[PDB]
Amino acid sequence: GAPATVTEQGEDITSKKDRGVLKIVKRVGNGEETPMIGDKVYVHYKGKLSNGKKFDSSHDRPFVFSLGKGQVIKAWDIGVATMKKGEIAHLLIKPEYAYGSAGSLPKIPSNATLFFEIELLDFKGE
């Protein structure tokens, strides 16, 4: 399903063009602005290992973070910076842009590919 669709059709939004972060816009957002680095960002997300085997969501209980400030994995700083208010996007992320060969046990194993659906609710300029 969704992870394989992002493999097949997703845009490579990396600078290096290494397919490390692939994106599909699922629902289009409003406004020309996207978050600049330093912004306070508000999202709903659903995430999982691409294997399907572990699963994690804000809409369970929004997730708040400062963009570009190392509170989230590199792929979120990259991916969320491309998104507009109201946008829902799918990301598929190689380990180099997430938790790498070290992983982050017990939640994330070594060399894990991650999938997220993200909704950008708001962002405000520090």
Ligand X SMILES: COc1cc2cc(c1OC)OCC[C@H](C)n1cc(nn1)CCCOC(=O)[C@@H]1CCCCN1C(=O)[C@H]2C1CCCCC1
Active site residue 97: no
74-83 burial: b if 16+ Cβ within 10 Å, else e = bbbbbbbbbb
DSSP class of residue 97?
G
The strand pairing partners of 28, in sequence order, are none
Distance of closest approach, residue 27 Cβ to ligand X, in angstroms:
19
Q: Which is nearer to ligand X, 32 or 82 (CB)?
A: 82
Active site residue 116: yes
The strand pairing partners of 24, in sequence order, are 90
Active site residue 45: yes
Q: Which is nearer to ligand X, 32 or 105 (CB)?
A: 105
Active site residue 42: no
Q: Which is nearer to ligand X, 10 or 91 (CB)?
A: 91
Q: In angstroms, rounded to a whole number, what is the distance separating the alpha carbons of residues 52 and 115?
A: 9
Q: Which residues are catalytic?
A: 45, 55-56, 73, 99, 116
